[PDB]
Amino acid sequence: SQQFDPYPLAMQFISQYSPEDIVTAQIEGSSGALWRISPPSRAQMKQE
């Protein structure tokens, strides 16, 4: 709330939400699976 205080629309929108309604998703930075790709398609990607 304090971050968006100088903006009224943000305060209204946040005010329309109860504390136990807004959640943060902590997504891991690294991928969760190997980047499978055919070498011809990788070469085509690099050429593109």
Partner: protein
């Protein structure tokens, strides 16, 4: 240049990560209009890296991409996003 495989470069793309997302009761979420009115100059930048690993030189490695925020405070290995339920 990253696809060249040298594990020293890195590239940052501006304004692709919407930090604030509204999760409505409908089947279509979307970024919040009010929290970020420009809708294109308020998205955080993202720097992406490729990590190879030793097991035809190109196909001789495992590889996986890594995502980090443009300027992080917590270890740069974690991307937070705020989503509002309904």
């Amino acid at each position: 240049q990253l696809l060249e495989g040298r594990p020293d470069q890195s590239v940052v793309i501006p304004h692709l990560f919407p930090k604030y997302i509204r999760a409505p009761n409908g089947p279509e979420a979307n970024p919040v209009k009010q929290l970020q009115p420009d809708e294109e100059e308020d998205y955080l930048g993202v720097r992406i890296q490729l990590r190879r690993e030793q097991v035809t030189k190109a196909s001789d490695f495992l590889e996986w991409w890594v995502i980090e925020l443009q300027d992080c405070k917590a270890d740069c290995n974690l991307l937070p996003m705020v989503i509002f339920s309904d």
